[PDB]
Amino acid sequence: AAPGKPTIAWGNTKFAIVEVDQAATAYNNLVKVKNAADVSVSWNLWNGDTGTTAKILLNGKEAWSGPSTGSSGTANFKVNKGGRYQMQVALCNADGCTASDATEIVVADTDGSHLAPLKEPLLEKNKPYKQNSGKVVGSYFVEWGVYGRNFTVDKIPAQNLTHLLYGFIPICGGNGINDSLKEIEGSFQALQRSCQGREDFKVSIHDPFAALQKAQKGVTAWDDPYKGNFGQLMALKQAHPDLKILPSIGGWTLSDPFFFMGDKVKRDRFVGSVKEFLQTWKFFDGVDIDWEFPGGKGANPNLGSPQDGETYVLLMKELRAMLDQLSAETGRKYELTSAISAGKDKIDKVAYNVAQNSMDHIFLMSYDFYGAFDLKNLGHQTALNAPAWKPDTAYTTVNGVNALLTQGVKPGKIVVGTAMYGRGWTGVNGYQNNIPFTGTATGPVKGTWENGIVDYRQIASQFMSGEWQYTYDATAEAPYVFKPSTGDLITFDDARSVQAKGKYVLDKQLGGLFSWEIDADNGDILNSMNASLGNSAGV
Ligand SMILES: CC(=S)N[C@H]1[C@H](O[C@H]2[C@H](O)[C@H]3N=C(C)S[C@H]3O[C@@H]2CO)O[C@H](CO)[C@@H](O)[C@@H]1O
């Protein structure tokens, strides 16, 4: 007789190639990368002969084999590839093999190979588009937006993007290295906790809870190895294998460490740690560098050197060489991008015409031109052109693009930015000819999350009715709303100024459009980005 039919023992069926330690706050203890997952199976045989060899099969293929020595057994073995496997125990003798019924096991890996695709319905006003223009369509998703903003990865209209950028990956360092963080309650300390035991100038994760542990749709089971934003990004990749998901290193409060990378020792260590981050987190497709800004004039009034431009070009060249190498080891295509100031004065600190040779796209931050940070000079925060009342306005999208083109940047590299928010003032007075921008202000407009700034969603929900005037400036290509009783004034992008930018991108042959930040749109801005770049409606 062939052996009797074994019964797989109840036990854990979910294992991980990259393990997350559920009780650790330091990124070094938090993540353990193994060559393979350690898997365990046990069985019982309730009827017949136990055979002479026991085997574990994964989809029919043996992963383990050993002498069958009793009515119960246990197999420990390694599995080096992620996915979901139909596992069987088989008992074999000279008269044949008898296999148990299949139990599925889960071997997790950071490409999301173990995960069901995160395919969600478009929400609010989002309408479906096909990415067939060949133009970049991007947006930033912020790590901390899962809290008060309650905007999670399952809510991203992912089919309407080519590029999804994750803001922000931090670089480790305490006093003197990340002093801009001290301006936000708790945030400097959260980074030192994350970086404990870890060399300065290596990347980390700022909020491992939001990134890897907060329960969220498709990753709510206690034994799911990756939860939070990263686990979702993994499942989103399974649904959209051509979506490029890039980690953005830096941003307004996390840029201070770039200022030290004139030191090649520190720069090498940074580049080495980006390589390691990409081998660790397989769902990411490259690296976005948001150094704000070479030369300073960012959050930290004490940083900035004339050497910065060189550092930048060096850093880009070295990241490319590291991405080329990673690309050859994996067969994947990897991208190197950067978000940059759109002002000519900052643009001219760097030879973008040299650095482009290392970069896939330049994300031109064509927004924040004006805001409550200046109560005396009012203007359009994200306009295409200067307005009729000040044709020599310094900060416009066009002046930005012209500055790169003039350096010799190829126009296809350049991705024009749109705002999914407004900035505005209160108490505007002293203006002439019904143009409130020629006045001066007494304060920030009351904001959605922080004063002087309003999500696009709320501009459309709350500020296009009642006493609010609405004007579309067709020379600038810029909408604004104005409440005369209070002198409340708001400058923003809308469907129309977005069409103007997308049409510009097509006329001028630029690379596409990207936006900050996805949680603030109601669908109007992203819809218009897609339409205006000529993407086809429909699924
Ligand atoms: C008004 C807002 S939402 N401010 C954010 C700030 O976002 C910057 C961002 O850092 C800069 N980098 C980009 C990439 S887009 C660009 O513009 C936005 C808004 O001006 O980011 C801060 C974190 O670095 C955050 O603290 C602040 O809430």
Side-chain angles (χ1 to χ4, degrees), residues 191-375 377-387:
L191 181 68
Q192 314 307 128
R193 195 204 306 124
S194 177
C195 291
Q196 182 152 97
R198 190 157 170 79
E199 319 202 296
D200 296 335
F201 304 97
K202 284 187 170 193
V203 295
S204 199
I205 289 173
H206 199 173
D207 175 341
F209 174 72
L212 273 172
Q213 295 176 340
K214 197 176 204 289
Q216 303 293 356
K217 200 207 261 262
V219 288
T220 44
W222 79 267
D223 46 2
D224 290 345
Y226 321 119
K227 302 188 183 47
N229 308 153
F230 286 24
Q232 293 194 303
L233 283 179
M234 288 170 201
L236 191 74
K237 205 60 185 314
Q238 293 301 135
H240 299 287
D242 307 317
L243 183 64
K244 312 277 159 204
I245 306 176
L246 303 180
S248 295
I249 306 179
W252 183 260
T253 58
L254 280 169
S255 292
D256 289 8
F258 293 113
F259 291 102
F260 303 81
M261 279 174 206
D263 185 3
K264 194 156 147 55
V265 174
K266 293 175 184 83
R267 198 173 66 238
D268 278 357
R269 188 189 300 147
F270 171 72
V271 174
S273 84
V274 173
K275 179 192 219 221
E276 163 193 70
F277 188 90
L278 292 174
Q279 297 170 316
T280 297
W281 300 115
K282 294 165 181 203
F283 64 97
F284 281 123
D285 291 304
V287 64
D288 180 47
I289 295 295
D290 305 344
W291 176 353
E292 317 183 6
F293 306 101
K297 300 202 200 167
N300 197 318
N302 312 315
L303 300 173
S305 133
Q307 188 189 176
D308 287 354
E310 183 186 44
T311 300
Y312 186 99
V313 166
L314 281 168
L315 175 62
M316 299 303 117
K317 166 173 153 311
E318 286 155 16
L319 287 171
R320 231 299 92 64
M322 171 288 288
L323 289 180
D324 289 337
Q325 174 62 35
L326 194 54
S327 189
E329 300 158 23
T330 63
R332 308 165 44 177
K333 169 239 216 312
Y334 277 105
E335 284 190 23
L336 173 53
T337 62
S338 183
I340 76 165
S341 172
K344 190 202 167 50
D345 49 334
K346 301 159 173 83
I347 281 168
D348 283 333
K349 287 151 179 345
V350 182
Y352 294 111
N353 69 297
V354 179
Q356 67 180 331
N357 295 314
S358 306
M359 299 165 74
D360 292 276
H361 313 283
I362 293 181
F363 289 122
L364 177 75
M365 295 188 292
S366 46
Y367 33 81
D368 305 337
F369 297 146
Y370 287 82
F373 46 82
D374 180 352
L375 306 170
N377 312 267
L378 317 174
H380 296 293
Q381 76 128 156
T382 190
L384 196 59
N385 310 289

Side-chain angles (χ1 to χ4, degrees), residues 140 142 144 149 168 184 248 250-254 288 290 292 339 365 367-368 381 421-423 450 453 514-517:
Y140 284 78
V142 306
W144 57 90
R149 292 171 170 84
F168 287 113
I184 300 122
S248 295
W252 183 260
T253 58
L254 280 169
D288 180 47
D290 305 344
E292 317 183 6
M365 295 188 292
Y367 33 81
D368 305 337
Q381 76 128 156
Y421 58 98
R423 298 191 160 273
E450 60 179 294
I453 297 111
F514 76 102
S515 51
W516 176 274
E517 41 178 285

